[PDB]
Amino acid sequence: ARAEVHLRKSAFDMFNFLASKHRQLPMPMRFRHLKKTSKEAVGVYRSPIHGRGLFCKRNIDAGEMVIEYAGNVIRSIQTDKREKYYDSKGIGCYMFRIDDSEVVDATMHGNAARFINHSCEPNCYSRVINIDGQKHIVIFAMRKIYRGEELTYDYKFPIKLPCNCGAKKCRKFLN
Amino acid sequence: KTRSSRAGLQFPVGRVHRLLRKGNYAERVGAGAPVYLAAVLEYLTAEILELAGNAARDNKKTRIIPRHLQLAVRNDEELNKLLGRVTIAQGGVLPNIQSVLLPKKT
Amino acid sequence: QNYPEEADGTLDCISMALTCTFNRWGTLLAVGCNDGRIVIWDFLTRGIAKIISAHIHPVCSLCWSRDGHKLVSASTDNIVSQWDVLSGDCDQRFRFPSPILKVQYHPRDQNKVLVCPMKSAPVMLTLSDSKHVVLPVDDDSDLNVVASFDRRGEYIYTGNAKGKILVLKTDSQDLVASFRVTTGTSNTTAIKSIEFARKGSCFLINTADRIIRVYDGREILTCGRDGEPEPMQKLQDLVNRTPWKKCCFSGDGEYIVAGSARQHALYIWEKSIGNLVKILHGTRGELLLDVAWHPVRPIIASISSGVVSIWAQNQVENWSAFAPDFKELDENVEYEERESEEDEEVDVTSVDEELEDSKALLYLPI
Amino acid sequence: KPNYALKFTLAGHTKAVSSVKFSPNGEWLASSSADKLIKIWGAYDGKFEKTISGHKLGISDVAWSSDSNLLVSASDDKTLKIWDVSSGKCLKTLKGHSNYVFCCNFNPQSNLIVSGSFDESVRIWDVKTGKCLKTLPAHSDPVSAVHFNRDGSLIVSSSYDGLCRIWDTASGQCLKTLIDDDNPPVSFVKFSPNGKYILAATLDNTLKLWDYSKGKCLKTYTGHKNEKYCIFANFSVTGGKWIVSGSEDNLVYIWNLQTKEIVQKLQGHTDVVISTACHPTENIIASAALENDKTIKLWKSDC
Amino acid sequence: LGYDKFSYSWRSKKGTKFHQSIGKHYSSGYGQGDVLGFYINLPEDTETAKSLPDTYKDKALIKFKSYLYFEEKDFVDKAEKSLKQTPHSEIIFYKNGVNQGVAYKDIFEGVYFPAISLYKSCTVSINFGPCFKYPPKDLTYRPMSDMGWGAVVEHTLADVLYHVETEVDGRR
Amino acid sequence: MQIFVKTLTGKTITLEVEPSDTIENVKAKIQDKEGIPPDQQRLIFAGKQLEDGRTLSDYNIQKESTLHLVLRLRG
Ligand SMILES: Nc1ncnc2c1ncn2[C@@H]1O[C@H](CSCC[C@H](N)C(=O)O)[C@@H](O)[C@H]1O
Ligand SMILES: [Zn+2]
């Protein structure tokens, strides 16, 4: 009340959208669905697991191609300077390593899929295909999406950033 | 002197007017009828051929086979509403398998 | 930028709304309600300003003063009154023998209002001494004449109901220029109205030959007494033959907009090329009353049947505007990294075109 | 030399006089404390006008509009009210905040109202009625101080993080996010008349002035104590070229625009100076402090 | 180039010397049609340290799908800590005779490889050898692309060159 | 000589016309100057008719005069 200093000062936040409401066929030619019919099935809202999240107002069942993840693809040499700048600006570990030779940085350029979370009880698994000679990562669902839930995929890290989700099977860590 | 360039269209207008005059659809027609018909035929032909070209570049083949036209007409929904009871020579059918007929195991 | 491409809903603070006009760049809306009251709505802010109990019989037209201190209203009961923007009461009250069509204030002379009486010559009423000065006209004096200022209001132009257009001075009234409209091929044509712009001195003319024409307010004083008609583009609708009721000029000086009556066909062109670019998709059932764009930003807002329909450009800034050094774009190329890795004692004090239609001084936060 | 000499020591509140504001008109002072009281005091004479009340808990911020008609106070009863300066009654309600209201100010155009609480966001309400309009997330921490720009188009938002942000009022999204690697907690921000500079009173014993034109760090303003409490700031251009700001060494300090000099040290308040206010048309400064001061000192001057 | 002590550079743009991400405005820039001379000034015999590997399992030989590959790999964190200085320790970035001055000194002690560093799409021609300007002093950079018995004998010589150690090593 | 071609927007353009240069060549020069096609332009002198397939000397227009270039449509 302007006379008592409250704690939790440092934030290091970038996407300043945190709110307390969160009121939520052959292969090659499927490219259209990526760019045109892929902007309504998912909303952006306050995640309950950690930070921000991609909530849902629509439904998508099993084996349905949903999103293509794109970002600043760089080589592994830039990883050193990128991690130094992550430590400087207070940037999370956005080192999306599609492989050990190319990593998808998401601190200077990235897509709306930068809003995802991690938990040992996720809803979707990753998959990657190759169209027109270019390798692109597209996710296919295994179950149905309910209205008001958040997309999350298992990072598949073999067993210090904790993973605070509250799930019973949640290993509390990226492992 | 020509008449198609007066509106900038591509489909002929004199041909349409002559063919409609000898088609005995009526006895007397106005002036805007042939240009209007040329325009609407232009729009429909462009609508179909753009998807035809998209399907041509789908398989990386320069020539457009009728299979591409069949796929482009069928996959769209407004065309399927308008081309309801029409088939295509050599057209084939778009792939489709019923959902409940999909075996699986562990 | 370009023509409006999005659609907006309605703006109905109160159920009825007859007339609308923007002041200089679309600040406040002058609604003349069909109940004898004068309501002021807020534009670009979506609110209301003031309600004035003018008189019993409703009004049919509205405009504001050059200094923004008056609310002139072409009444349907011949109440030529100067309602105050500030207090809401009547400052000056006068009665005219004929009702008024088009009320305007000269951006350089608010003393002489614009009046368009019917079957009589236009009359300038001076607010300083309540004196009426009749505009000298030619030939008949019982025609449906409409009088209107130029861009600067320095010359006044009048249109009659037989085929004759007159040019004279807004203050000296030196009628030294006339004009005869083309007589078609066999039969002559009268003039319904004319409408001006804020840049270029162009003006549309609406006639009874079902065709909208365009002239410029510079070829009549240059030709002299009377010359030969020579429009730029005889625009018209040649598929339905919709008559024309109200049409204004663009908010940039290069477009032309024309309004239907009941067909919900709002047409647009450009002065450079007379080729149609877009058509408005309006829901049938209502009669259009007034149209006037934003005098600076491309947008269309048409009032009709007590409601208003706006076709606009709704805009929200992209998510990538967090900081100039922060972007949220997508690329598939490798990142291009950087390649290049006083003391004074002075305090701080510093804090279309523009015309004089300002100083409304009407805003009530509570 | 700023000869701001004390003339009146004002003390009417009970808990702690920690918010006194010299409005841009400079007609009356809306002294506030953490005792749900809004006392109207004089400026050139310190005459007692009245004590507008009606809220339930303490106030965190008080502000008057450009014409000093509206009165916003950060009452912690989950609501805010506008109190009529002429009479002293509740004009309109500002319900909607889910926790204690910590920051609230006005717009120089006198057409918008801003408020903020512990819901990681800020909100605005209608002036004629007072209904919900927007919920714009300001930062991830409770917001300490915000204010509209002099041109009425931008807002500078400060929370205890350090990454100072400028939020566009026309869209509700941030324009410049000046990010600090050290992330020093911020207490107060204020717009310059030109709307290009901002003074973010960072809680690191330094008034880190920010220029959001290019994203470069400005000079280091030292010569005070600023670590914990919500230190505010104001300008002073009447007598000379001065910028007044609070200090946590229990004293009132002033500096220059870009010289980094201790031009004036007003002493006498026994507690940490939490707020500083300077009169618009005269060299009069009133500084509010914490619990151990409870006094308002009018440092009048002429040059 | 210059990020580590192993590499030495002189920037083409504005001539600003850069090393270990540290930059000083030193000389003028170069670029289009600018031939960069290079004469590492050690005409006299020196001494250096060549090899000191820290890993072995990554140095193995196994069929990939139909052919062998020799995993001859370097390391980093161990090699950087064996860093030493040596004689004529100066990598001078000339300008075809004219020199702006050696930008950085105290070069790493080891086998020298003239590194050409690019940053985007750009072509560049080369001429290296124990000569001054004309490439053909020794055999003019033979590609060993011929069908005669010379290719056969050279390939067999190389085969034996590695066969001696693949016999005397002893495979796990 | 020199004459003025007044447009609709309000810009004034000064051009040079020879005593023995036909109007068609003047229109071609204008088209190569500012890009406005001859089909989009026609000459009007104080509300009086001027054609394209003629010459200035046939009309005998005085110097330093203004011509109302009343706008047209392509084709
Ligand atoms: N639940 C969690 N708790 C802590 N870190 C998490 C997390 N989920 C994902 N992360 C980490 O955060 C990084 C992405 S940044 C997190 C997404 C986004 N900033 C948001 O607000 O949601 C990933 O590299 C991942 O390792
Ligand atoms: Zn868990």
Short mmCIF file of C-alpha atoms in Angstrom, two decimals, chain A residues 25 28-29 32, chain B residues 54 58 60 95:
data_model
loop_
_atom_site.label_atom_id
_atom_site.label_comp_id
_atom_site.label_asym_id
_atom_site.label_seq_id
_atom_site.Cartn_x
_atom_site.Cartn_y
_atom_site.Cartn_z
CA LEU A 25 -4.65 -37.80 -48.69
CA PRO A 28 2.98 -32.64 -50.30
CA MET A 29 -0.15 -30.61 -51.09
CA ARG A 32 -2.42 -24.79 -47.61
CA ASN B 54 -1.99 -25.40 -58.71
CA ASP B 58 1.56 -30.16 -57.16
CA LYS B 60 5.73 -31.07 -60.65
CA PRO B 95 -8.92 -41.04 -52.55
#
